[PDB]
């Protein structure tokens, strides 16, 4: 089966992905943005040296990279999880995170949403900073993060209404008793789904 895996930024989605790939050998885990960067660096070596250089491309060029990355991903034949985002926040508001072409090509069975308590997102973002993984203190409010998660749920349901796919919401909003518990719980739920 094929699932898109989503969640607000910096909340633990990467860790879930890495843990899934460590645990299940019957599974390929890919990060869409990384595949986009790699395919872009192949075609535009002069402009794209690091993942964030993707912002510099002209629209006609960026769109064709997303399509090409999706085609590359769709060559995978066993279980697949694609790490990406339901929406991005910009000054103009939220913008959908999947182009319809991406879904037409990958043909996901469903969308998985990791939903957190916004305080845990603020804290994870700051811990990632103290470990080096990001330069500036994130200043999103609990309110802004909740809004994002609500909007993401609506995007996922809309994509399901359009394309007929599962919408799997994984509740990680409860308090952790021990460290890594949210991540461990999500990984096991995804594995059990895949092996059902």
Binding site for its own copies (CB under 8 A): 1, 87, 90-96, 99-100, 109-112, 143, 147, 150-151, 153-155, 157-162, 164-169, 171, 192-193, 196
Give the one residue of 4, 6, 8, 13 binding Cl ion; rule: CB under 5 A. Answer: 13
In angstroms, the first-to-last Cα distance of the chain is 11
Distances (CA, A) of 11 to 28, 42, 183, 187: 21, 30, 10, 14
Instruction: Indicate which of its own copies, Cl ion, none lies near residue 46 (CB less than 5 to 8 Å, by partner kind).
Output: none
166 binds, among its own copies, Cl ion, none (CB under 5 to 8 A by kind): its own copies
Residue 104 is encoded by which pair of tokens?
Answer: 């037409």
Residue with tokens 């066993």: 78
Residue with Cβ nearer Cl ion (2 or 13): 13
Phi and psi (nearest 5°) for 112? -110, 130
Q: Kindly state whether residue 182 participates in binding Cl ion, applying the rule CB under 5 A.
A: no
Binding partner of 14, given Cl ion, its own copies, none, CB within 5-8 angstroms per partner class: Cl ion
Q: In terms of CB distance, is 32 or 159 closer to its own copies?
A: 159
Residue 96 touches which member of its own copies, Cl ion, none, C-beta under 5-8 Å by kind:
its own copies
Contact 194, 27 (CB under 8 A): yes
Could you tell me if 58 and 44 are in contact, meaning their C-beta atoms sit under 8 angstroms apart?
A: no
Number of residues counted as binding Cl ion (CB under 5 A): 4
Is residue 14 a contact point for Cl ion (CB under 5 A)? yes
Structure tokens at 171: 């509740």
Q: Which is nearer to Cl ion, 10 or 97 (CB)?
A: 10
| Token pair for 184 | 């461990």
- Nearest distance, CB of residue 91 and its own copies, angstroms: 5
Q: Is 133 exposed, middle or buried, given 0-12, 13-18 or 19+ CB atoms closer than 10 A? A: exposed
Residues in contact with Cl ion by the rule CB under 5 A:
10, 12-14
């Amino acid at each position: 089966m094929r699932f898109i895996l989503t969640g607000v930024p910096g909340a633990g989605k990467t860790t879930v992905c890495n843990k899934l790939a460590e645990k299940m050998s019957n599974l390929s885990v890919v990060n869409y943005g990384d595949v986009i960067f790699e395919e872009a660096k192949k075609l535009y070596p002069s402009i794209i040296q690091v993942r964030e250089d993707t912002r510099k491309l002209p629209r006609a060029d960026y769109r064709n990279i997303q399509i090409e990355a999706a085609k590359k991903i769709s060559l995978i034949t066993d279980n697949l999880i694609v790490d990406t985002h339901m929406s991005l926040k910009t000054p103009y508001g939220f913008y959908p995170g999947l182009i319809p072409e991406t879904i037409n090509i990958i043909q996901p069975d469903g969308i998985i949403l990791l939903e957190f308590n916004p305080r845990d997102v603020i804290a994870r973002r700051e811990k990632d900073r103290l470990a080096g993984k990001r330069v500036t203190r994130d200043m999103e409010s609990e309110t802004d993060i909740l809004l994002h998660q609500q909007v993401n749920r609506m995007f996922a349901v809309s994509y399901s209404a359009i394309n007929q796919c599962y919408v799997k919401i994984i509740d990680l909003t409860w308090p952790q008793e021990y460290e890594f518990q949210h991540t461990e719980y999500a990984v096991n739920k995804i594995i059990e789904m895949l092996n059902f």
